[PDB]
Amino acid sequence: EKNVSIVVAASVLSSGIGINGQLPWSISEDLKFFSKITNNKCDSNKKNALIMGRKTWDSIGRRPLKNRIIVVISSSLPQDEADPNVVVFRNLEDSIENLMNDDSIENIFVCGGESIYRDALKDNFVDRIYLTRVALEDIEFDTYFPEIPETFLPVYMSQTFCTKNISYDFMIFEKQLKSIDDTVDLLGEIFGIRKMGNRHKFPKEEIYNTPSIRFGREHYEFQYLDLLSRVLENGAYRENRTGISTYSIFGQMMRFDMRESFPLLTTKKVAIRSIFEELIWFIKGDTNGNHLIEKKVYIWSGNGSKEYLERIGLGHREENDLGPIYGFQWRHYNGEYKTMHDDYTGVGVDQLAKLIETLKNNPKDRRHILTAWNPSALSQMALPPCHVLSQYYVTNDNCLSCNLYQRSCDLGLGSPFNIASYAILTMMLAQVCGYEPGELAIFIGDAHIYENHLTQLKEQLSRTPRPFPQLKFKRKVENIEDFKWEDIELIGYYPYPTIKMDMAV
Amino acid sequence: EKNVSIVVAASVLSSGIGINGQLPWSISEDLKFFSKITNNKCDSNKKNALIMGRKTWDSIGRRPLKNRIIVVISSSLPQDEADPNVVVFRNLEDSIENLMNDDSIENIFVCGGESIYRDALKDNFVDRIYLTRVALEDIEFDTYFPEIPETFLPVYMSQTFCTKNISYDFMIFEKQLKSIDDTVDLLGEIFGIRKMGNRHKFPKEEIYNTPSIRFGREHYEFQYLDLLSRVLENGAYRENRTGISTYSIFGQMMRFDMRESFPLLTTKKVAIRSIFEELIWFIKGDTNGNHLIEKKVYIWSGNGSKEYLERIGLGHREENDLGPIYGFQWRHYNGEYKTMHDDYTGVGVDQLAKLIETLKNNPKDRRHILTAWNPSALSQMALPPCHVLSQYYVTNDNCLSCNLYQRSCDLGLGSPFNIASYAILTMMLAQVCGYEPGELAIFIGDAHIYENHLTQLKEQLSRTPRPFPQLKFKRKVENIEDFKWEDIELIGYYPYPTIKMDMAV
Numbered sequence A, B: 001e002k003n004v005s006i007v008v009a010a011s012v013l014s015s016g017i018g019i020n021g022q023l024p025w026s027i028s029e030d031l032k033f034f035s036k037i038t039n040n041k042c043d044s045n046k047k048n049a050l051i052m053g054r055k056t057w058d059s060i061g062r063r064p065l066k067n068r069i070i071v072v073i074s075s076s077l078p079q080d081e082a083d084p085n086v087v088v089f090r091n092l093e094d095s096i097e098n099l100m101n102d103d104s105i106e107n108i109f110v111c112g113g114e115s116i117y118r119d120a121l122k123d124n125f126v127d128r129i130y131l132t133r134v135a136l137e138d139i140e141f142d143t144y145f146p147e148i149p150e151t152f153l154p155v156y157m158s159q160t161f162c163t164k165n166i167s168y169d170f171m172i173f174e175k176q177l178k179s180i181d182d183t184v185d186l187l188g189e190i191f192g193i194r195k196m197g198n199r200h201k202f203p204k205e206e207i208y209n210t211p212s213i214r215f216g217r218e219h220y221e222f223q224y225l226d227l228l229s230r231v232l233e234n235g236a237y238r239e240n241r242t243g244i245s246t247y248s249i250f251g252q253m254m255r256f257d258m259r260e261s262f263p264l265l266t267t268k269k270v271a272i273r274s275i276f277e278e279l280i281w282f283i284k285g286d287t288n289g290n291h292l293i294e295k296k297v298y299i300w301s302g303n304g305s306k307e308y309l310e311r312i313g314l315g316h317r318e319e320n321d322l323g324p325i326y327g328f329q330w331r332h333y334n335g336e337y338k339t340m341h342d343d344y345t346g347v348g349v350d351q352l353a354k355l356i357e358t359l360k361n362n363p364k365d366r367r368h369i370l371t372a373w374n375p376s377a378l379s380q381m382a383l384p385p386c387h388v389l390s391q392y393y394v395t396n397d398n399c400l401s402c403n404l405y406q407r408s409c410d411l412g413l414g415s416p417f418n419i420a421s422y423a424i425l426t427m428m429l430a431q432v433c434g435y436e437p438g439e440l441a442i443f444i445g446d447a448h449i450y451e452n453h454l455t456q457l458k459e460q461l462s463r464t465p466r467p468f469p470q471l472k473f474k475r476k477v478e479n480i481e482d483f484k485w486e487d488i489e490l491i492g493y494y495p496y497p498t499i500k501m502d503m504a505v
């Protein structure tokens, strides 16, 4: 018995692998991954056999790969006994004689060819599958990768990598001590809620996104999805200011990479434009909700309405005057707020400007902080800061990392918007201060799910994540408030269909 | 071959197990743990054999344990063939006939008796050890547990539990797929710092506290020690405002239980009194450093000195006037600061009072927040807020949890003080609002280690953690500012010797 693995790079959605006798992309990291995953062996006296179709053998220029034995499947090619590194077989079944014979082979890799892949899967010869998902689909294919049968299960999904603005992921599909566990379970039986481990129970399979992936949950969307599962599992059913009660947990975090990708969720189509527009709406220090509504962004509609304002004791307020809310605290901290029409230029403390200036004049400073929590202005605000305070870090290799603390988190609506918003903000601050994006860490206080989002989020959990998209700016601005929506280019975003969820006013 | 495990409850330090023919403690959870861990089996047709000394057999009143077979070691006790649940052997070696015969036994437990433990270890018959450390040493013992030989290694250390104000823990000592790992390593070879996984490398064994404990690192001091290892591994060497450079990492967190213990480090003797005194110094809203120095607490000496003040542009300031530093922002937010002698009563926003009032009048609120970051007052402060903003959470079972964000963290000096300080503060707020302590989550921005603390912290990492102590208040106060040091009772704190480390001014 010998292990037979499949190595293949296919597109994310249609699973295209080739076009016109060649690859529809050029990724050096992918080819290198192939070379390394095929050169991996234990015995130095042994080699790995590489099975591929005739057309694939033509694709590589009919030249052998070093330290490996290429097996070409063809009905026309002759059994060229000259080259000891290349061998030709009539059929795929007969080609797998590496098992019964030639103990000089340690591993077998089914390496190419839709005609080869399809009948290597159909006749069940494959043990493992190394799938390299690539994030393009608006191109032309003529050769596809066959749909993976239910006999295989994903056990690994790497973080999203980027090469030439192309997103890609590495996945592994597999064909499928007690003492500590027992002790912990027993202690969990003796002590009840006393044992903190029982307060943070591991999510059940029924609410665990892609349960088969246990140790290889490297993709950073899992940082959010596993949180969703955790709230869905240990969430204490509690009431709030709105009529809709939530399942809530306290003290959580999510990490994100921004160097090789952009933390925009793929399990649900997220309105990026609204996020950006809200972000630059903050940056300008604007508190007029209509300015957001005029651009067809209605995320601040419910918290702006006359009924809601009069209800929270702000009946004197105009139809969409949100008050000294974010941006106003960024650009005019401790500034006496009147109306949304007044010109608050020069007044208050401009945290954002000083933040940029400090970021570029003193990167290794341990104070880069932007806050929005102002006790003196909380009573005037239409809604107190959820994403309360942020801190920025400049690494030694000139990268910009961002930490954000969030007192309250709507895992259905608010969360993705916050992640993407502070990601984009981090990128803006990076370009303005002359750095590159780094990492995004979000620390959450009250992580909760509204009871009217249950079926929706449980639907979202039934979707296996796709590689994060890329975000590129079309032009470099001199002032951070000069950013426009047309300046934003989102590359390789192929998310699952949108999920409609109502906001609790 | 059959598994032979040792079950024993010993004191934390001197490893005492008995006094005057009985136990020096009464812990129902421990006895229950024994009963479970000895009743654990797979085959219903089999039983577990318990080996114990004659005196131990006398200790249990000479009555058999249900669903188990008690094996008594005695040279005088007759071989009672009456009771089929109790059997007597003349020596320990002969007693281990359960291995060669009687297939009705599934597991063997060496259950008691220093005379039994010692020669069960000396003749090497034990495979596993279930040690229940107990936190009391100022009592009398006559029977001890022999020192564990180097052939055993800890693989598990539970969280500190509390029964009758006694701290205890459960540990296991043992006598001692590749594909995903290979793939991740290869990706780590291809992509360099691009791969975020390589930016957060797992700490090496040389700097990993108790490396043998891999999957059973349940103790919450590991939340700090593993952080220490992480900074010690991935720490970017960078400069700062002080002449002493630090190794720094960004975006971390530590979780702590306060229900069954008190997060006070045992690997180093921490000055609790100074921590408390500083805490109530904050609560009163006092900014006079002398008030702290008068009580022999010198943690704010360096950041108060005339030289340091004149250096940071506060030469007009008095010898120890720190300015609108924490407490002043807690009790008098946005209050115009003059000197430390002025009476700031009634001025500014009292965040602490409103926090308490909101905590008891509206527990399920999501705005329980105490901040200290005031951009308008930062220039006047002797040192900007490190523990910047905190949020509090009342649980459905009336427990009080606390989250704290810290922009900058001195893992040598500041960190333990912060943990203990906000733990005590959480407990105070719990008693004043009529709740019980819950969990403490600390989210850290710039987690760094000063280069002059290296050998010291590397020394601290060489110490295997002990169970957390307990903190109890001797009286219930009406006002939170009425707390006194005499009202604090620290029970079961047996830490490793103190480690002297200098503060970077």
Ligand SMILES: NC(=O)C1=CN([C@@H]2O[C@H](COP(=O)(O)OP(=O)(O)OC[C@H]3O[C@@H](n4cnc5c(N)ncnc54)[C@H](OP(=O)(O)O)[C@@H]3O)[C@@H](O)[C@H]2O)C=CC1
Pocket (backbone or CB within 6 Å): A007, A008, A009, A010, A017, A018, A019, A020, A021, A022, A023, A052, A053, A054, A055, A056, A057, A059, A073, A074, A075, A076, A077, A090, A091, A092, A111, A112, A113, A114, A115, A116, A117, A143
């Ligand atoms: N991104 C990726 O992971 C990969 C992509 N590719 C792409 O695939 C494209 C081409 O693949 P594809 O069109 O499917 O052709 P194939 O790669 O499957 O190779 C075709 C050859 O296989 C031989 N063959 C197939 N079945 C049999 C059989 N039952 N008996 C004998 N010989 C057989 C044929 O030889 P004969 O005609 O003599 O009978 C034929 O010439 C390439 O452009 C390449 O870029 C290839 C590998 C990997």
Ligand SMILES: NC(=O)C1=CN([C@@H]2O[C@H](COP(=O)(O)OP(=O)(O)OC[C@H]3O[C@@H](n4cnc5c(N)ncnc54)[C@H](OP(=O)(O)O)[C@@H]3O)[C@@H](O)[C@H]2O)C=CC1
Pocket (backbone or CB within 6 Å): B007, B008, B009, B010, B017, B018, B019, B020, B021, B022, B023, B052, B053, B054, B055, B056, B057, B059, B073, B074, B075, B076, B077, B090, B091, B092, B111, B112, B113, B114, B115, B116, B117, B143
């Ligand atoms: N906290 C814990 O985990 C535990 C604590 N304990 C404590 O230990 C205390 C007493 O233990 P300890 O003083 O060590 O006495 P032991 O528990 O070891 O039991 C003593 C008996 O062992 C017999 N014995 C020992 N060695 C031999 C031998 N080589 N051949 C024949 N018989 C032998 C003796 O019988 P004989 O005199 O007839 O020769 C003796 O009566 C108790 O008070 C109990 O509370 C006990 C178990 C667990």
Ligand SMILES: Nc1nc(O)c2c(Cc3ccc(C(=O)N[C@@H](CCC(=O)O)C(=O)O)cc3)c[nH]c2n1
Pocket (backbone or CB within 6 Å): A007, A008, A009, A028, A030, A031, A032, A033, A034, A035, A036, A060, A065, A111, A112, A131, A132
């Ligand atoms: N993830 C992935 N990417 C692929 O390109 C394939 C292929 C097709 C293929 C197979 C091998 C190569 C190839 O030239 N590899 C090289 C290139 C060397 C290098 O760039 O480092 C090698 O092993 O030395 C190029 C294309 C077959 N299976 C594949 N799987």
Ligand SMILES: Nc1nc(O)c2c(Cc3ccc(C(=O)N[C@@H](CCC(=O)O)C(=O)O)cc3)c[nH]c2n1
Pocket (backbone or CB within 6 Å): A269, A270, A271, A274, A297, A298, A299, A300, A303, A383, A410, A412, A413, A414, A415, A417, A499, A500, A501, A503, A504, A505
């Ligand atoms: N209870 C509650 N939850 C919230 O998330 C908020 C917010 C922030 C916010 C964030 C997202 C939305 C929102 O409607 N997002 C959407 C729709 C986006 C769109 O079509 O414009 C979605 O992707 O499902 C609306 C408001 C503002 N006020 C809120 N109140």
Ligand SMILES: Nc1nc(O)c2c(Cc3ccc(C(=O)N[C@@H](CCC(=O)O)C(=O)O)cc3)c[nH]c2n1
Pocket (backbone or CB within 6 Å): B007, B008, B009, B023, B028, B030, B031, B032, B033, B034, B035, B036, B060, B065, B111, B112, B131, B132
């Ligand atoms: N952690 C630990 N604690 C101990 O007390 C021991 C002992 C001594 C011992 C052994 C057994 C008992 C005992 O009565 N166990 C019981 C009590 C029942 C109960 O409280 O649930 C049982 O199994 O039903 C009491 C003392 C031997 N080894 C021990 N290890």
Ligand SMILES: Nc1nc(O)c2c(Cc3ccc(C(=O)N[C@@H](CCC(=O)O)C(=O)O)cc3)c[nH]c2n1
Pocket (backbone or CB within 6 Å): B269, B270, B271, B274, B297, B298, B299, B300, B303, B383, B410, B412, B413, B414, B415, B417, B499, B500, B501, B503, B504, B505
């Ligand atoms: N660079 C730097 N690091 C810090 O930790 C601080 C602090 C807070 C602080 C926290 C702890 C101490 C401290 O000396 N701790 C000690 C000694 C305690 C004592 O004996 O009183 C220790 O346990 O090692 C001193 C100051 C205040 N200013 C600081 N500046």
Ligand SMILES: O=c1[nH]c(=O)n([C@H]2C[C@H](O)[C@@H](COP(=O)(O)O)O2)cc1F
Pocket (backbone or CB within 6 Å): A240, A241, A384, A386, A387, A408, A409, A410, A411, A413, A414, A415, A418, B366, B367
């Ligand atoms: O960016 C946001 N993210 C978010 O999650 N909320 C949600 C969280 C909360 O459930 C709701 C109202 O906040 P509060 O908890 O004070 O009622 O708004 C609001 C935002 F503006």
Ligand SMILES: O=c1[nH]c(=O)n([C@H]2C[C@H](O)[C@@H](COP(=O)(O)O)O2)cc1F
Pocket (backbone or CB within 6 Å): A366, A367, B240, B241, B384, B386, B387, B408, B409, B410, B411, B413, B414, B415, B418
């Ligand atoms: O509670 C504290 N905890 C702490 O870690 N510091 C350290 C962190 C920092 O390294 C140093 C000075 O802060 P800064 O980074 O602004 O120089 O004080 C200070 C405190 F008061």
